[PDB]
């Protein structure tokens, strides 16, 4: 399910010399919860939308409890459509690998 262009997006977030520290502040406060992520979905839909436009990379790629909750719980047009396709192709791969 993973194509090579998605790894070209994920790997550049690893080698980002200007990675946003603010999404660590969220992931400390969220710490992977069901109810707590619902309370901040009008915030993290902006942080992704302000990071996919300022550069070609996408954020919140740290823990599984933030990638899974973006895909399965939005299903919407909050994140740009070009960015939200990469998030589905990650969880399209993992469900394929199991």
């Amino acid at each position: 399910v993973i194509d090579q262009l998605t790894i070209d997006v994920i790997q550049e977030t690893a080698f980002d010399p200007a990675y946003p520290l603010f999404c660590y502040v969220i992931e400390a406060m969220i710490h992977g919860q069901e109810e707590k992520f619902v309370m901040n979905m009008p915030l993290i839909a902006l942080v992704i939308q302000t990071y996919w436009v300022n550069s070609g990379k996408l954020a919140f790629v740290n823990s599984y409890h933030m990638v899974r909750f973006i895909c399965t719980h939005m299903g919407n047009g909050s994140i740009p459509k070009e960015a939200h396709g990469h998030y589905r192709k990650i969880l399209g791969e993992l469900i394929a690998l199991e």
Partner: protein, 245 residues
């Protein structure tokens, strides 16, 4: 054998004596001042009790969680990953103690840097250059109620599979693993806001796929001095793990 520090953890009947649960935020509106009582009074160097959310046997599966951490992330990042510990009650001292968050005169549907002073939050919101509204930070304040304590390291020693139960010494039948509870894994922090990460986070190298030198050399200036004194430990394979971990 779940080794929470010194005391072991054998049977599930000892669950309330070693593992503290914190359920939904909505169900704990009665016990909510009781949570802050243990944030000051109790010594967090000898607590010997970790904090987790209560598990849901129908929500998650470990294999989808396991493939995200051991397979896809070290390959797509070439092994640049360090384990991070969080001081949570020093995090929310930035967000709540703001001045636009506290005062109720300021419009809730308003930008943040129109009203925020010289502090850390002017410069943390200079990193991403994000413009949230006031309510958006105000809900991030509300996470401090059920917020966990200092990130604890619980080591898991299991017996090996009965295919492999042959070894020389007696401890060789058991193979171990460290699970960093209530922390998270992270990339290299930008050097323009290293001073803010120094005032929020601290690194814990705890696993061979997550003990990387050139990521941890951002998170604390002592380890940045550790690399420049001897350049033998710039590689992820060679790098020295603390034997207490």
């Amino acid at each position: 054998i779940i080794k929470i520090g010194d005391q072991n953890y054998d049977n599930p009947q000892n669950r309330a004596t070693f593992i503290n649960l914190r359920g939904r935020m909505e169900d704990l509106v009665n016990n909510l001042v009781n949570i802050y009582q243990t944030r000051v009074n109790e010594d967090h160097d000898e607590r010997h009790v970790l904090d987790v959310a209560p598990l849901d046997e129908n929500d998650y599966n470990p294999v989808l969680e396991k493939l995200f951490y051991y397979v896809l992330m070290p390959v797509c990042s070439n092994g640049h990953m360090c384990g991070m510990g969080v001081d949570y009650q020093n995090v929310a001292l930035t967000l709540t103690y703001n001045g636009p968050v506290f005062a109720d005169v300021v419009n809730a549907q308003d930008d943040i840097l129109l009203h925020l002073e010289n502090g850390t939050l002017k410069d943390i919101l200079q990193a991403g250059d994000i413009r949230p509204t006031v309510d958006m930070i105000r809900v991030l304040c509300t996470s401090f109620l059920t917020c966990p304590f200092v990130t604890q390291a619980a080591r898991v020693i299991t017996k090996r599979d009965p295919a492999q139960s042959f070894a020389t010494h007696e401890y060789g039948k058991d193979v171990a693993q460290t699970v960093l509870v209530n922390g998270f894994g992270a990339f290299a922090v930008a050097d323009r806001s290293r001073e803010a990460a120094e005032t929020m986070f601290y690194p814990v190298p705890f696993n061979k796929l997550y003990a990387d030198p050139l990521v941890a050399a951002t998170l604390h200036p002592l380890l940045a001095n550790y690399v420049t004194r001897l350049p033998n430990q710039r590689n992820a394979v060679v790098f020295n793990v603390p034997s207490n971990l």
